[PDB]
Amino acid sequence: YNMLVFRDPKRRPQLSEEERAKVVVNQAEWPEEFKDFDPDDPYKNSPEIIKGMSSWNLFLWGVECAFIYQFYELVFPKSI
Amino acid sequence: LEPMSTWYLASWAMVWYYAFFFWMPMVWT
Amino acid sequence: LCNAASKVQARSAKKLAALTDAGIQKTISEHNANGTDAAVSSTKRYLAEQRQLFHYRVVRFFDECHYIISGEYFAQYTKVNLIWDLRFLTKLVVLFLIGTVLGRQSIFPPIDPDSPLVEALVTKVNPNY
Amino acid sequence: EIQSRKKYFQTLGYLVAFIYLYFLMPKEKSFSGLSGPDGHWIMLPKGRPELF
Amino acid sequence: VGNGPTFSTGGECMNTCDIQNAFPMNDRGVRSSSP
Amino acid sequence: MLLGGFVPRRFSQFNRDPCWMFFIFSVGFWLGEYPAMMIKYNARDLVYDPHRYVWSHHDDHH
Amino acid sequence: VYTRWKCDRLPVFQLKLFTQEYPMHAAVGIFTIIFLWKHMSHCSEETERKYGWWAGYPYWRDPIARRNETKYKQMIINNDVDITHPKWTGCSVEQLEELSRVV
Amino acid sequence: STVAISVQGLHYVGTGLAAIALAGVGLGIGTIFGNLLVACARQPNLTKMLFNYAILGFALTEAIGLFALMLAFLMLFS
Amino acid sequence: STVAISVQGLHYVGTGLAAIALAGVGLGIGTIFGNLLVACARQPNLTKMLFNYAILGFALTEAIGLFALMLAFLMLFS
Amino acid sequence: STVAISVQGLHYVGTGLAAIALAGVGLGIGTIFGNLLVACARQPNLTKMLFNYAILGFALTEAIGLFALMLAFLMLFS
Amino acid sequence: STVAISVQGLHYVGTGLAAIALAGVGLGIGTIFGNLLVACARQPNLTKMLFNYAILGFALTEAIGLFALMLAFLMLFS
Amino acid sequence: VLFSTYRSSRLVSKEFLHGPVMRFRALGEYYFQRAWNGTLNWALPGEYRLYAVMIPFIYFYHRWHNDHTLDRDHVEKAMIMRWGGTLEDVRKLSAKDQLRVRCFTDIEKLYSAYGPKDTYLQPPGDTLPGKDFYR
Amino acid sequence: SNPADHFRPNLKALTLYAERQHYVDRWLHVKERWLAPWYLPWWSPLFQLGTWYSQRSRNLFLVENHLSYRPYKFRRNDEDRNNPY
Amino acid sequence: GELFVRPKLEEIPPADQCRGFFGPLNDSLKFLRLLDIKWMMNR
Amino acid sequence: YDHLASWGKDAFLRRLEFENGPLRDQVEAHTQRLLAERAAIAK
Amino acid sequence: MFLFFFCDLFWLRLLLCMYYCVWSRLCFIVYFNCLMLIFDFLLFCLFDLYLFVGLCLFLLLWFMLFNLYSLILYYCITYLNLYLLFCIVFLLYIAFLFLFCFLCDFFLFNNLLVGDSFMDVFFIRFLLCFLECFSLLCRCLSTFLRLFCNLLSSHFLLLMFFDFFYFIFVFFFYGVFCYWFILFIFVFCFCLLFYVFLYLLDLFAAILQLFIFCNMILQLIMDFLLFLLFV
Ligand SMILES: CCCCCCCCCCCCCCCCCC(=O)OC[C@H](COP(=O)([O-])OCC(O)COP(=O)([O-])OC[C@@H](COC(=O)CCCCCCCCCCCCCCCCC)OC(=O)CCCCCCCCCCCCCCCCC)OC(=O)CCCCCCCCCCCCCCCCC
Ligand SMILES: CCCCCCCCCCCCCCCCCC(=O)OC[C@H](COP(=O)([O-])OCC(O)COP(=O)([O-])OC[C@@H](COC(=O)CCCCCCCCCCCCCCCCC)OC(=O)CCCCCCCCCCCCCCCCC)OC(=O)CCCCCCCCCCCCCCCCC
Ligand SMILES: CCCCCCCCCCCCCCCCCC(=O)OC[C@H](COP(=O)([O-])OCC(O)COP(=O)([O-])OC[C@@H](COC(=O)CCCCCCCCCCCCCCCCC)OC(=O)CCCCCCCCCCCCCCCCC)OC(=O)CCCCCCCCCCCCCCCCC
Ligand SMILES: CCCCCCCCCCCCCCCCCC(=O)OC[C@H](COP(=O)([O-])OCC(O)COP(=O)([O-])OC[C@@H](COC(=O)CCCCCCCCCCCCCCCCC)OC(=O)CCCCCCCCCCCCCCCCC)OC(=O)CCCCCCCCCCCCCCCCC
Ligand SMILES: CCCCCCCCCCCCCCCCCC(=O)OC[C@H](COP(=O)([O-])OCC[N+](C)(C)C)OC(=O)CCCCCCCCCCCCCCCCC
Ligand SMILES: CCCCCCCCCCCCCCCCCC(=O)OC[C@H](COP(=O)(O)OCCN)OC(=O)CCCCCCCCCCCCCCCCC
Ligand SMILES: CCCCCCCCCCCCCCCCCC(=O)OC[C@H](COP(=O)(O)OCCN)OC(=O)CCCCCCCCCCCCCCCCC
C-alpha cells in the first residue's frame, strides 16, 4: 500500500509452492503484536507509543498551535 | 533582481570559494 | 440520480459486511430483524450512561484534585506526563483566546473614539456589517 | 573514536550557530533602525596628518 | 536478538548488482548482503 | 531514495511511531492555519487602513 | 599502511589535495577571487539606496549620511586636520570671518 | 526639440512575445513523444530505454522554454 | 523634456500574444495522438502502455500551455 | 521642424521578438530526439553512437539560441 | 506641414525581428541531424561520410545565421 | 617537530567523553545505519521517517525566521510611511491600531496580484488621505 | 517585483566599508615591512614577485593617454548614465 | 578521436604541388609563398 | 552496538524480525495463502 | 564593501555530522558516468581521466543540498546569482582546459580543423575551426546559463502558483457553505493536482539539471582523451 509517495515494502516469497504447502502454521508461537497478520494492515494491533494519545489528538494539537500562532497578537498586541 | 546584481558579488562568491577550499576536504575525508 | 444512489448503497453495504466485529454485526442483525435503528439506540444508551455517571465524574474530579494536591502526582512524574501537560497548556491557551474573542464579539479589538482609525469605521462600504 | 568525538563537538557548535542565526541574530540594515547594524567604515588612517 | 545494525548495503539488491558474485548465495537462492 | 520504513496504513496508525506523530502534528498545523486565516482576514470588524493610499510598495519599486 | 586522507591531519591533507591533486583548479580559483575583489568590490551610495536595503532606503533618517559623518569626524579628529584651511574652503581665514559676520 | 518619453505599458507587449516561444517548445515536446510511440511499436523490447531518452529530450527542449519564460517575468516585473 | 506616459489598454495586446502560445500546444497534443493511432495500428497489443505515454506527453505539453496561460490571465489583470 | 523623440520602453519589444527565435531551437531539438527514438528501435546495437551525434546537434542547436538570448540581455539591460 | 521626427528606440525592434531569423536556422539544423540519425541506422557503414555532409549543411545554415546576426548587431549599434 | 602532521598524534585519552559520544552515535545510527536507508549521493535518504521529521522542522524554523526577522521589516516600513514617516509617529499609536495596520498589510500580501486594486489605487472622488497628506 | 525579492540571501549580518586607497596603502606598508630586511636580497624571486608586477601595472597606468574620459571609480553616484561626475 | 601518427618523410608531397589563392606559386614565384596565407594553410 | 540496546526495536524492526526470523516460513505460507484466497474471491 | 553572511546549510551540516560520523556505503549516484569512461576492455588512458570524480561528487552533494531542499517553502538558494555560477563553471571548465593545454601537445587540436582535405581550407575548414573554438566557450556559458535559468523559472512559477492558491483558499472557501460550492471544489481539486505536478516536475528537473551540468564537463574532458590499446 501507499501513504502519499511512501510505499510499504513487501517481502518477496522464497519458498516454492510444493515446499510452502508442507509448512504448518502455528500462530500460538507468534507474538501477540502479530496475530492474524495481514500484509495490507500489519500494524493494526501495534501498540501506541503513548497510551490514550490518538492521531486525531495530535492533529488537533497542531491545529491549536496554528490558531495560537495566528490569534495571540489579537489578544496580547505589542507596540512596535 | 539581486541574482543579476554585482554590487556585492565578491562577498557573495566567497561562500562558494570557502566551500571549495575548506569544506570539500572535510567531506572528502 | 438513481444509478448513483444504487452504487452508493451497494458500496456502503459492502463496507458494512466487510467489518469483522462480532458485537457490531450482532447488533446490526438484531436491529434489522426488529426493524429498529442501531445508531439511534447507541446514542440513547450513551446519553443514559452519561446521565447516570455525572456524580461519578464529580467524585473522580474530587479524587483527582486530592491526588494532585497531595503531591503524589508529581512524585511519579515522567516524560509522558510532561507531554500531556503541554497538550493541556496548549488547549488552555487556545480556549482563553477563543473566549476573549467571543466575549468581545469581535476578532479584533474595538476602536476607541479618539483613535485615528475611526475614519475607517465611518467609510464602511456596508454600514450594516 | 576520533571522528565520533570530533563530530559530537561539531554538532554542538552547529546547533548553537543554527539557534543564534535563526532565532537571535538580527538582520542588518533595518528600515526602522531598531535591529541590526547600518554598517560603518574601517581601516581609517590614524596619526597621519601629512595624508591630508 | 539485538537491534544492532549490520554490514551496510547502500539500499542495493545483491542478486542484480554489478558485483553480485562477491556476495555468497544461500540455499534459498538469495545472495547475502555481506561477504 | 524512498526504499523502506514504517508506513501507517491509515490515519489512526500515525500514533504508532514518534516520527509520524510529529508528522501528523505538523500536518495539523499546516491545514489548520488556513481556517485561522479565513476567520481572521475575513472578519466583519476588519477595517482597511485609512492611510493605505498614502504610500504603497507599487510606487516604491516603480 | 599510510594514506593521505586517513593519516594526515586536515590542513596537511588540504594542502596536498590542492597542490598535487587539484592545483590548476586552485590557481584558477585564486585568479577569479583576485578579479572579483579587484573589479566587483565597490558599491556607490546611490546603488545602496536603490538596491542595498531589504525594504528600501529609510530616507527619514539617512543612515548613510550618519555613517559618512562619523567617518569624517573620526578622520579629522585622529589626523588633526584643519578643515578651515584655505584649500578646503577656497578662501583665506579673514575672508571666512568676514563671511561669518556678514551672514 | 529634444523630447524623452517613457511608456510604461510596453512591458506587457514584450512579455506576450516571449510566450510565443513556448509554441515551438510545446510542439517540439509532442514531436518527441510521437516518435516514441511510433518507435515502441517498432521495437517494444527497448521501451524502457526509449522512455529514458524521451525524458532527456523533453528536459533539454523544456529548458529553452524556461529561458523565454524568464524574460517574460523580468519584463513583467519591471 | 522628461515625459512619462501610461498606456492602459496595452495589457490586452500582451495577453493575446500569450494566447498564441497555445497554438503549438494544441498542435503538439494532436501530433501525439496521431502518432499513437499509427503505433496502435502497427502494434495492437500495446494499447495501454502507449496510451499511458500519450497521457504523459499531453500532461507535459499541457503544462507548457498552462505556464503561458498564467501570463495571459496575469497581464489581463494587471 | 527637427524633432528628436526617445521612447524608453521599446527595448521590451525587441527582447520579446528575439525570444521568439527560441521556438525554432526547441522544435529542432524535439525533431532530433524524435528521429533518435525512431532510429534506435531500428538499429539498437548502435544506440550509443547515435546518442553522441544527437547531443552534438543539441550542442550546435542550443548555441544559436544563446545568440538570440544574448541580444535579449544586451537590449533588456540597455 | 513638414515635420521630421527621429525615434531613437526603433533599432531594438529591428534587432529583435532579425533575431527571429534564427528560428529557421535552428530548425534546419535539427532537421539535418534528425535525418543523419535515421540514415546512420539505415546504413551505418557510411557514418563518416554522412557526418561530413551533415557538418557541411550545418555550416551553410550557420553562415546564414551569421548574416542575420550581422544585421542585428549593425542595427543595434548604428 | 613543533606540530605533528599525522592524525595518530593524540591530544586526549581514548576514554574522554566516551558516554556522551556513545549516546550521540546511538542517536545517529539507530535510524540511518539500515539497509533501506540507501542515500542518493548522500543527500536523499531512503528512510521515510527522516523526511517526515526533517521537512516540518526545516519549514518551521525557516518560517519563524522569515516572519520575525524578514517580513517584519516590510511591515515596519509600511507602518512608518503610512502613519507619519517616522518611528515616533507610529509609536504615538496604540497597540490595537498597530495590529490593525499590520493585519491590513497581511491582507495586501495575500491578495498580491490576484485581487482588487482599490487597496492601493485611490478611486476618483475618494475622501481618504492621498500621497501628499504628510508633505 | 515582490516575487523577484524572494531570491535574496536571508542571513545577512554585517556590512563593512573601506576605501581602496586606505587598504592599498596598508598592504603596501605590510609588503615593505616584510620585504625590507637585509636577509631578503632584491634579486631574490620572492622580492621580484612582490614588486615587479605592481610596478609594471602602475607604470602602465601612468603611461596611459586616453582620448576618452574614465569616470572616477568611487563616485557617490554611478547609476546616472548622463552624468559621469 | 583516434591516434595520430606523423607522416614519414617520403609521404610528404612536394612544395610545388601546393596551391595558393589563385594558383601554384612555382618557380619565379616561390618567394610569394611567404605572403600567401592560403598556400601556407594548404601546405 | 551495546549503546543501542536501550533503544530497543520499533514497529518496523519488530515486523522485520517476525517476518525474517525463525518463523519466516510460517509467516510466508500464511501470507501467501491469504493473498491467494483474496485474489480468488476478487475473481 | 565587505558583507558578512551565512549559507542556509547549517542544519544540513549538523545532520551530515550526526549521520556520517560512521561509514556508510554509496550505491546510487546522480552522475555515474564519471566513474565509467571506458566501456571496451583493453583500452587505457595515460591521462588522469578519473581526476573529475571527487569534484563531481562534491558538486552533486552541494547543489543537491541547496536545490532539492529549496522546494521547502522559505528555503533560500544562497548561491543563486548569474555571475557566481559563471565563476564556478569558469573555474571547472577553464581548469580542465588549461590542464589539456599545459600538456603542450598541439596535435591534440588537429580535430578542431573540421572536414577533410577535399574541402577548401581557407573558406570552409578555417571557418569551421573558428566556430568550434567559439562553441567551446559557448558550451561553458550555456551550461551556467541553463543551470541558473531552470532554478529561477521554476521557483518563480512555484511562488506565483502558491500565492494564487493561498488567495483562493483563504478568500473563497466560504463558497463551500454556499450554493456554488461545486465550482470551488473543482477549482480546489485542480489546484491540488497542479501543486503535486509542479512539485514532482521540480524534483525531477533539479536532479536532471545536475546530471547535465556534470555531463557537459565530462564531455569537455572526453573530447580530448585518447585511448591506447593493450597488446
Ligand atoms: C447569531 C446568533 C443566532 C442564534 C439563532 C438561534 C440559535 C438556536 C437557539 C435554539 C432554537 C430552538 C432549538 C432548535 C434546535 C434545532 C436542532 C436540533 O434540535 O437538532 C436535533 C436534530 C435531531 O433530533 P431528533 O430527530 O430528535 O433525534 C433523534 C435521535 O436523537 C437521533 O440520534 P442520532 O443517533 O441520530 O444522533 C446523531 C444526530 C444528532 O446530532 C445532533 O444533535 C447534531 C447537533 C444538533 C444541533 C444542530 C443545530 C443546527 C443549527 C444550524 C447550524 C449551526 C451549526 C451546527 C454545528 C453542528 C456540528 C456538529 O445527528 C444529526 O442530527 C445529523 C445531522 C446531519 C446530517 C448530515 C447528512 C448530510 C447528507 C448530505 C447529502 C447530500 C447529497 C446531495 C446529492 C445531490 C445529487 C444531485 O438534529 C438536527 O436537527 C440536525 C441539524 C443539523 C444542521 C446542520 C446545518 C449546517 C449548515 C449547512 C451545511 C453547510 C456545510 C456543508 C455543505 C455541503 C454541500 C451541500
Ligand atoms: C597524550 C596526551 C594526553 C592528554 C589527555 C587529556 C585529557 C583531558 C582533556 C584535555 C583538555 C582538552 C583538550 C582539547 C580538546 C578539544 C576538543 C576535542 O576533543 O576535539 C576532538 C579532538 C581530540 O583529539 P584526538 O582525537 O585525540 O586527536 C586529534 C587528531 O590527532 C588530529 O585531529 P584532526 O586533524 O583529524 O582534526 C583536527 C581539526 C582540523 O585541524 C584544525 O582545525 C587545526 C587548525 C585550525 C586553525 C584555525 C584558525 C586559523 C586562523 C588563520 C591563521 C592565523 C595565523 C596567525 C599568525 C600569527 C599572527 C600574528 O579538525 C576539525 O577542525 C574538526 C573538529 C572541530 C571541533 C569542533 C570545534 C567547535 C566546538 C564548539 C563547541 C562549543 C560551542 C559553543 C557553546 C556555547 C554555550 C553557551 O581534537 C581535535 O580534533 C582538535 C581540534 C582543534 C580545533 C582548533 C580550532 C580553533 C578555532 C579557534 C581559534 C581562535 C584563535 C584566536 C586568535 C585571536 C587573535 C586576536
Ligand atoms: C605577511 C603576509 C605577506 C606579506 C607580503 C610578502 C611578500 C609578497 C608576497 C607576494 C605578493 C604578490 C603580489 C602580486 C602578484 C601578482 C598578483 C596580483 O595581481 O596581485 C594583486 C593584489 C596585490 O597587489 P599588488 O599587485 O602587490 O600591488 C598593489 C596594487 O597597487 C593594488 O592594485 P589593485 O587594483 O590590484 O588593488 C585591488 C586589491 C585586490 O585585492 C584582492 O583582489 C585580494 C585578493 C586576495 C587573494 C587571496 C589568495 C589566497 C586565497 C586562499 C583561498 C581562500 C578561499 C576563500 C576563503 C573565504 C573565507 C575566508 O589590491 C589590494 O588591496 C591587495 C591586498 C591584498 C591583501 C591580501 C590578504 C589575503 C587574506 C587571505 C585571507 C584568508 C582567510 C582564510 C581563513 C581560513 C580559516 C580556517 O592582490 C594579491 O596579490 C592577492 C594575493 C596576495 C597574497 C599574499 C601572500 C599570501 C597571503 C599572506 C597573508 C595571509 C593573511 C591571512 C589572514 C587570516 C585571517 C583569519
Ligand atoms: C567589528 C565587528 C566584528 C567583526 C570584525 C570583522 C573583521 C573583518 C576584516 C576584513 C575582512 C574582509 C573580507 C570579508 C569577506 C567576507 C565574506 C563572507 O562573509 O562570505 C560568506 C562566507 C559564508 O560561508 P559559509 O558557507 O556560511 O560557512 C562559513 C561558516 O563559518 C561555517 O563554515 P564551516 O562550518 O565549514 O567552518 C568550520 C567549522 C566546523 O564546524 C564547527 O566547528 C562548528 C562551529 C561553527 C562556528 C562557526 C559558525 C558561526 C555561526 C554564527 C556565529 C555563532 C555565534 C557567535 C556569537 C557572537 C555573540 C556576539 O569550524 C569553525 O568554524 C572553526 C571555529 C570554531 C570556533 C569555536 C570556539 C569555541 C570557544 C569556546 C570557549 C570556551 C571558554 C570557556 C571559559 C570558561 C571560564 C570559566 O563566509 C566565509 O566563508 C568566511 C568569511 C570570513 C572572512 C574573514 C573575516 C576576518 C575574521 C573576523 C574574525 C572576527 C573575530 C572577532 C569577533 C568578536 C565578536 C564581535
Ligand atoms: C527522493 C524524492 C523525495 C521526495 C520527498 C517527498 C515528500 C512528501 C511530503 C508530503 C507533504 C509534507 C507536508 C509537511 C508539512 C510541514 C508543515 C507545514 O506547514 O509545511 C508547509 C509547507 C509549505 O506549505 P504551504 O505552501 O501550504 O504553506 C502555507 C503557509 N503560508 C500560508 C504562511 C504561506 O510544506 C512544504 O513546503 C512541503 C513541501 C515538501 C516538498 C518535498 C521536499 C523534498 C526535499 C527535502 C527532503 C528533506 C529530507 C531530509 C532527510 C535528511 C537528510 C540528511
Ligand atoms: C470539504 C468540506 C469540509 C472541509 C473542512 C476543512 C477545514 C475547514 C474549516 C472551516 C472553518 C470555518 C471557516 C470560516 C470561513 C470564513 C468565516 C468568516 O469569517 O466569514 C464571515 C464573513 C464576515 O464578514 P462580512 O461582513 O461578510 O465581510 C467582511 C469584509 N470586511 O463573511 C463571509 O466571509 C461571507 C460568508 C457567507 C457564507 C456563510 C456560510 C456559513 C453560514 C453558517 C455559519 C455558521 C457558523 C456558526 C459558528 C459560530 C461562531 C461563534
Ligand atoms: C619552542 C619553544 C622554545 C622556547 C621555550 C618556550 C617554553 C615556554 C613554556 C612552556 C610551558 C608549557 C609546555 C607544555 C607542553 C607543550 C608540548 C608541546 O609543545 O606540544 C605541542 C602541542 C601539539 O602536539 P601535537 O602536534 O599533537 O604532537 C606533539 C608531539 N610531536 O601543542 C599544544 O597542544 C599547545 C601547547 C602550548 C604550550 C605553551 C607553549 C608556549 C611557547 C612559547 C614560546 C615563546 C617563548 C616563551 C618564553 C617564555 C619565558 C618565560
Automatic annotation (TrEMBL), chain B:
Where do the TM regions start and end? 7-28
Specify the protein name.
Uncharacterized protein
Q: What is the organism lineage in this UniProt record?
A: Eukaryota, Discoba, Euglenozoa, Kinetoplastea, Metakinetoplastina
Q: Which gene encodes it?
A: Tb04.26G5.190
Automatic annotation (TrEMBL), chain G:
This protein's GO CC annotations? mitochondrion
Q: What is this protein called?
A: Uncharacterized protein
Source lineage: Eukaryota, Discoba, Euglenozoa, Kinetoplastea, Metakinetoplastina
What is this protein's gene name?
Answer: Tb03.27C5.274
TrEMBL record, chains H, I, J, K:
Q: How does it sit in the membrane?
A: Multi-pass membrane protein
User: Transmembrane stretches, by residue range?
Assistant: 10-38, 50-77
Enzyme class comes to: hydrolase
Q: Which GO terms describe its biological process?
A: proton motive force-driven ATP synthesis
Q: Where along this sequence does the record place binding of UTP 2? A: 42
Q: V-ATPase proteolipid subunit C-like domain spans which residues?
A: 14-75
According to its UniProt record, where is this protein mainly located? Answer: membrane
Q: Where in the cell is it found?
A: Membrane; Mitochondrion
- GO cellular-component terms in the record? mitochondrion; proton-transporting ATP synthase complex; proton-transporting two-sector ATPase complex, proton-transporting domain
Superkingdom of the organism of origin: Eukaryota
Could you list this entry's UniProt keywords, alphabetically sorted: CF(0), Hydrogen ion transport, Hydrolase, Ion transport, Lipid-binding, Membrane, Transmembrane, Transmembrane helix, Transport
Q: Name one GO molecular function term.
A: hydrolase activity
EC number, UniProt record: 3.6.3.14
Per UniProt, UTP 1 binds at 42
**What family is this?**
Belongs to the ATPase C chain family.
- Name of the protein described by the UniProt record: ATPase subunit 9, putative
* Species per Swiss-Prot/TrEMBL record: Trypanosoma brucei brucei (strain 927/4 GUTat10.1)
TrEMBL record, chain L:
Superkingdom, taxonomy of origin? Eukaryota
One GO cellular component this record assigns the protein to is: kinetoplast
Please state what the protein is called: Uncharacterized protein
What is the source species? Trypanosoma brucei brucei (strain 927/4 GUTat10.1)
